[PDB]
Ligand SMILES: *[C@@H]1O[C@H](CO)[C@@H](O)[C@H](O)[C@H]1NC(C)=O
Ligand SMILES: *[C@@H]1O[C@H](CO)[C@@H](O)[C@H](O)[C@H]1NC(C)=O
Ligand SMILES: *[C@@H]1O[C@H](CO)[C@@H](O)[C@H](O)[C@H]1NC(C)=O
Ligand SMILES: [Cl-]
C-alpha cells in the first residue's frame with residue numbers, strides 16, 4: 161500500500177504493541193491497554209516516566225524504502241468442523257448438449 | 258525484574274523513538290540542503306535540535322540505571338559507549354561560556370576575512386582575489402609575503418582564543434574520573450572488557466606511537482626528489498641544498514603538499530593527451546555517470562539501490578532561481594531511505610568524487626540489521642575507509658579503456674608512460690608530515706604539563722625537527738597557528754585520517770589473491786570478480802558489535818596494520834625513487850633558514 165496509508169504530516173493512526181510481558185496463544189485478541197512498566201510500583205499517577213505503556217505508533221511517510229513502507233496483510237484461516245459445509249469453491253458448468 | 262531485562266525493555270523503546278527522532282531531524286537536515294528558503298532557515302534548526310531536545314534529558318534518563326550486573330555485552334556496548342556527559346555535571350554558566358567561545362572560534366573564522374593593508378583600492382579576499390595572483394607569478398613582492406599575510410592580518414586577532422580553550426580542558430576532563438577529555442574522543446577507542454580481541458590499556462603507546470615508524474623511510478625517498486623540483490620559477494631565494502618555504506600550499510592553512518603536482522608539470526601550455534574529457538564528444542549526461550556507479554557495484558556483486566533513489570537524489574543543478582547549496586554529502590536518513598547530495602553537472606571531474614562517495618551509502622545498507630545505536634562506523638575513519646578504497650579504483654585502465662575512449666590506431670608504446678604515473682606520487686604521503694606534528698599537541702598536556710611560560714614556545718620547533726617545512730619570517734607568541742586550521746576550530750580529532758591511509762591496503766590486496774595479476778600490476782579492476790563476490794559480504798555487515806580493533810579479520814586475519822601491502826602496488830613508483838638519492842641534501846640541518 162503506497163498511496164493508501166502514507167501521510168506527509170504523519171500517519172499516527174495505526175497503533176501496535178511493542179512491549180508485552182505475557183507471551184501469546186493463537187487466535188487471541190489483545191485490546192486491553194494495561195499500562196506496562198519496569199518499576200516495582202502500581203504506576204503512581206496516571207502515566208509518565210518509568211511507566212512505558214504498551215501502545216506505540218507508526219510513522220509512515222511516503223518516501224520510505226522497502227521493509228518500512230507499509231503493507232496490508234490479511235489471512236484466510238480455514239477450518240473443518242462437525243457442522244455441514246457451507247462455504248466452498250466455485251463449480252463451473254458447461255453447455256447443454 | 259533483573260537489570261538485563263530492564264536494559265532491553267528500555268533500549269527497545271529507546272531505539273524505536275530514536276529512529277523516529279532521527280527521521281524527524283533528518284527531514285529538516287535534508288530539505289534545507291535542497292530548498293534554501295528563509296522559512297527553511299527557521300524550520301531546519303528547531304527540528305534538528307528536536308532530536309537533541311529529547312536526547313539532552315533522555316540520555317540522563319537512559320543511564321539512570323547504573324548497569325552493574327549486565328551480562329550481555331551488546332546492550333552494554335549500546336549504552337555505556339554513548340554516555341552523554343555534559344553540562345548536567347559541573348555547571349551551566351561555564352558550559353555556556355564554552356558555547357560563547359564556540360561562536361567566535363568557528364563562525365567568525367568561517368570563510369575568513371582578508372583585507373589589503375597596502376592600498377584600499379584593492380578590495381580582494383582569500384578566494385576572490387589572492388588565488389589569481391597565486392596561480393601565475395614571477396616576482397617576490399607578494400609570494401613569500403603571502404604565508405605571513407594571514408599572520409599579520411588574522412593571526413593577531415585570534416590571540417585571546419589560544420589560552421582559555423586549552424586551559425578549559427583540565428576542568429572539562431575531571432567530570433567522570435577519566436584521565437583525559439580526549440578519552441571522550443577516545444570513547445569508541447576504549448574497548449577493554451573482552452577476551453583478547455581488543456587493545457589493552459597498557460598497549461595504547463604500542464598502538465599509536467609504533468605505527469609511524471614504518472612509513473618514515475618512505476618519506477625520505479620523495480624528500481630528496483620533490484625538494485629539487487623547484488628549479489622552474491624560484492630565483493635567488495631557495496637553494497637546492499636547502500628546504501622548502503611555507504607558501505607552496507595552494508590555500509592559507511595548507512594541510513597537504515599534494516598540490517605540488519601542478520607545479521611540476523613538464524609541458525603546461527602543450528598537453529600530451531587528455532583522457533578525462535573523452536566523455537564530451539560522445540556527450541553522456543549525468544544519468545550515465547550514476548548508472549555505471551552501481552554497475553561498478555553490480556560487477557563486484559553488491560546489490561542495487563532501492564526504487565526510491567533515482568527521484569529524490571540530486572541529479573540536476575537547481576541553480577539560482579531555486580536557491581540551494583552544493584555540498585557533496587552522502588545521506589542515510591534511516592528506515593530504508595537511501596539518497597545522496599552531490600554537485601552533479603555535465604563535467605567529468607565529478608566522476609571520481611561520485612565513485613568515492615558511492616561506497617558510503619553501500620556501507621549504509623550494510624548495517625541495516627541492527628538499530629541506530631550501532632548504525633555508524635566502528636571508529637571515526639571507517640565511514641570513509643571503504644570510500645577511500647574505491648576512490649583510486651575508478652581511474653583504472655580496464656574500466657576506462659574498455660568503454661571505448663582510447664584510440665585504437667595508437668600502438669602500445671612503453672616510453673609514453675612517464676607522465677601517467679607522476680600524478681599519484683604526491684597523493685599518499687603529502688599530508689603525512691602534517692599528521693605527526695599535530696599528533697603531539699593536545700594528547701597529554703592538559704593534566705598539568707603546560708604552564709603559562711611554554712604555551713607556544715613548545716609548538717614552534719616541532720615543524721623543523723621531523724617535518725622539515727621551515728618558516729621564512731621569525732615569530733613570537735602573537736602568531737598563533739592552530740586557530741587558523743579548519744579541523745581544529747570544530748575540535749575534530751585527527752585520528753581518523755591517521756588510520757584512513759593505513760586501513761585501505763589490507764583489503765586492497767585481497768582483490769587479486771591468486772598471483773597478484775595475470776602479469777604486471779599496472780591494471781587492477783573488479784570487472785567480473787566472482788571470487789570477490791561473496792568475499793566482502795561478511796566484511797561489512799558487522800558494524801559496531803565487533804569493534805574497530807578486529808574489524809580487519811574477516812578475510813585475512815591480521816592483528817595489526819603494516820605498510821607491506823603498499824609495496825606491490827607502488828612498484829613503478831618505488832623503483833622511480835630508490836635510484837634517485839645521489840645528489841640531494843643528506844641528513845637534515847636543524848638551523849637552516851631562508852632569511
Ligand atoms: C544479547 O543481545 C543481542 C542483541 O540484543 C541478542 O542477539 C543476543 O541473543 C543476546 N544474548 C543473550 C545471551 O541474551
Ligand atoms: C538494479 O539493477 C538490476 C540490473 O543489474 C535491475 O534488474 C534492477 O531492477 C535494478 N534495481 C532497481 C530498483 O531498479
Ligand atoms: C567471471 O569470473 C569467473 C571466475 O573468475 C569465471 O568462471 C566466469 O566465466 C567469469 N564470467 C565472465 C562473464 O567473464
Ligand atoms: Cl606542534
Ligand SMILES: [Zn+2]
Nearest residue numbers: 587614641644
Ligand atoms: Zn566523504
